[PDB]
Amino acid sequence: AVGACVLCNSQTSLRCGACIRRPFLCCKCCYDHVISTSHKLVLSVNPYVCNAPGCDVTDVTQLYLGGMSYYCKSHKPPISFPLCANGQVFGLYKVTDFNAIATCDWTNAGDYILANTCTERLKLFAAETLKATEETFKLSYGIATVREVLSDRELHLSWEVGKPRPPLNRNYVFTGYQIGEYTFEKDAVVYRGTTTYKLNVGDYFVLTSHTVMPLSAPTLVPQEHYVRITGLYPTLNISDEFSSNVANYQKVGMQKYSTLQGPPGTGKSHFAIGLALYYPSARIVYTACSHAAVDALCEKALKYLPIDKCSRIIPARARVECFDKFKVNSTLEQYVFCTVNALPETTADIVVFDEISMATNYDLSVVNARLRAKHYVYIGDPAQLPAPRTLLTKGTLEPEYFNSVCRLMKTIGPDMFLGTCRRCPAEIVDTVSALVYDNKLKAHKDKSAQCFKMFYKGVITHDVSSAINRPQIGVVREFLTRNPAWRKAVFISPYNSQNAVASKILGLPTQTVDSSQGSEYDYVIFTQTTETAHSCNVNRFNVAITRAKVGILCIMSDRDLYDKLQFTSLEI
Ligand SMILES: [Zn+2]
Ligand SMILES: [Zn+2]
Ligand SMILES: [Zn+2]
Numbered sequence: 001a002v003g004a005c006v007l008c009n010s011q012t013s014l015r016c017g018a019c020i021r022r023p024f025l026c027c028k029c030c031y032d033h034v035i036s037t038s039h040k041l042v043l044s045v046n047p048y049v050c051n052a053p054g055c056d057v058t059d060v061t062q063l064y065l066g067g068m069s070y071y072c073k074s075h076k077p078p079i080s081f082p083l084c085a086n087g088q089v090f091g092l093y094k095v096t097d098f099n100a101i102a103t104c105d106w107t108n109a110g111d112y113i114l115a116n117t118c119t120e121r122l123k124l125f126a127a128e129t130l131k132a133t134e135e136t137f138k139l140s141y142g143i144a145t146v147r148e149v150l151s152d153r154e155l156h157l158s159w160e161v162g163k164p165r166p167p168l169n170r171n172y173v174f175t176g177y178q179i180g181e182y183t184f185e186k187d188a189v190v191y192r193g194t195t196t197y198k199l200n201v202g203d204y205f206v207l208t209s210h211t212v213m214p215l216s217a218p219t220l221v222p223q224e225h226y227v228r229i230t231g232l233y234p235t236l237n238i239s240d241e242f243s244s245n246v247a248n249y250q251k252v253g254m255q256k257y258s259t260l261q262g263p264p265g266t267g268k269s270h271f272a273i274g275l276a277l278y279y280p281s282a283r284i285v286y287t288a289c290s291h292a293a294v295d296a297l298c299e300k301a302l303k304y305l306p307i308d309k310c311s312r313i314i315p316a317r318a319r320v321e322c323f324d325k326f327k328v329n330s331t332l333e334q335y336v337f338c339t340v341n342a343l344p345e346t347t348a349d350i351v352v353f354d355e356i357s358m359a360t361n362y363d364l365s366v367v368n369a370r371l372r373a374k375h376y377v378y379i380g381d382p383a384q385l386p387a388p389r390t391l392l393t394k395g396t397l398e399p400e401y402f403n404s405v406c407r408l409m410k411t412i413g414p415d416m417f418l419g420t421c422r423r424c425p426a427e428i429v430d431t432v433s434a435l436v437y438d439n440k441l442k443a444h445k446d447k448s449a450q451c452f453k454m455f456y457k458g459v460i461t462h463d464v465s466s467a468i469n470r471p472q473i474g475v476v477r478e479f480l481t482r483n484p485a486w487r488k489a490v491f492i493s494p495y496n497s498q499n500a501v502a503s504k505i506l507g508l509p510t511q512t513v514d515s516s517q518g519s520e521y522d523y524v525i526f527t528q529t530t531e532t533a534h535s536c537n538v539n540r541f542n543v544a545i546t547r548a549k550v551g552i553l554c555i556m557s558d559r560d561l562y563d564k565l566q567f568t569s570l571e572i
Pocket of ligand 1: 016017018019033039102
């Protein structure tokens with residue numbers, strides 16, 4: 001009840017009772033909140049409510065102090081002070097942006113913009129509020145009761161009447177009933193249990209409403225520059241394989257935190273694992289939001305770092321299969337590979353946070369909370385995909401608003417930029433270089449002459465809101481008969497539903513752009529499916545075409561993105 005004011009840190013007894021997080025507001029700040037917003041309930045030891053029996057006045061602007069108690073205009077004694085006067089609310093020890101964050105429903109881009117252009121304590125307030133709102137929204141959706149079981153991977157579902165049904169994809173994970181987490185894909189529908197269970201009829205699934213803990217740590221610890229490499233000890237015998245990165249590795253040592261922008265295939269993993277070889281005694285925690293991102297860092301580490309000094313941290317509430325070739329849950333190994341949400345309370349010489357475009361400010365805060373470290377390294381690419389904002393339906397969230405790291409990378413630039421793509425045929429490198437990297441990304445590879453574009457709008461059907469384009473798949477089927485080398489190709493599209501149909505008709509393995517991120521494949525077939533802001537997003541497009549090492553076929557719906565592809569055009 002006695003805390004610090006989220007805006008100016010001043011001590012007070014005043015929390016807003018109208019904010020979902022109930023932040024401590026100082027007398028001067030609590031005023032400027034309650035006089036500008038629909039937020040009128042002020043809490044303390046005891047609520048600012050009229051003490052008169054049966055009186056329902058809770059609005060602080062309609063309330064007065066009479067003795068050591070509070071009353072409305074109808075009930076106050078002759079000698080009474082209005083609680084709200086002289087730009088203050090009476091409390092012990094006696095902001096536009098705070099107001100917009102406190103009251104917004106988080107459905108507008110402008111909400112996320114302000115949650116990332118504000119002060120550092122407001123970014124945390126913003127982040128808890130957003131996450132709180134995100135969780136209280138999961139309650140809104142309807143329960144999914146099993147009507148009948150078909151096979152070991154398919155069933156039919158009965159939904160709760162009166163409550164909406166949540167988008168059916170791999171994004172939305174339910175907890176079954178505690179028979180383990182589950183996912184669903186398209187009256188036949190496909191069931192995928194984290195725990196293999198003989199699906200029982202009647203049993204129900206509900207969305208995993210996890211409790212939003214308060215944040216304490218900043219998103220970014222304040223920046224420190226050093227004259228000399230602080231708290232780390234470099235090698236002189238540094239493998240030629242990592243010689244390119246020595247000056248960057250010395251930058252990491254001469255700052256508290258550092259930002260690395262590495263476009264696809266430019267050596268992010270190589271740089272991350274290369275940091276351990278350059279500072280060989282240093283204890284490094286390797287963290288990212290997703291199991292895949294951490295598992296990619298584990299695969300790199302397996303190749304170059306001693307396996308006896310590596311641990312993959314796994315939460316006992318195990319969700320997906322992940323990396324098995326380390327000692328599991330040894331927190332005290334020199335090398336710890338762990339998802340943000342599972343991080344132990346520990347210390348480190350270096351923390352490497354990877355896939356930073358996918359991090360929220362909640363995630364950035366948590367990492368600073370659990371890991372006290374000499375150096376924080378932030379790796380990823382603001383031209384790649386952000387974390388889905390499940391509440392955001394209006395406006396598009398630009399890369400400079402993804403999180404504080406991306407904001408820095410897009411405003412003052414990254415500390416370090418990996419400038420040469422070694423994965424992709426030049427046709428792909430030249431396209432994305434112009435599109436999102438201001439022509440600063442260079443091709444190592446030659447043009448493959450295996451990169452093709454076809455402008456084919458086809459016909460757009462919808463599985464609810466998820467888009468399908470059968471004719472675009474028809475064009476792919478036709479291409480495959482004439483191009484048998486592409487038989488091995490991964491099929492990629494911005495929509496699960498399109499992927500479901502392409503799986504059945506083509507037999508290619510299938511991936512959404514968003515799930516493709518971090519992976520690479522010899523051949524990619526991309527069907528844009530629709531012309532929407534989702535399918536035309538330049539970051540998503542960037543990720544889609546940079547998955548390929550040898551060949552790509554893009555069936556396009558959008559003239560702009562089609563024309564920009566520096567590919568050989570096909571006919572039909
Ligand atoms: Zn409030
Ligand atoms: Zn204040
Ligand atoms: Zn009253």
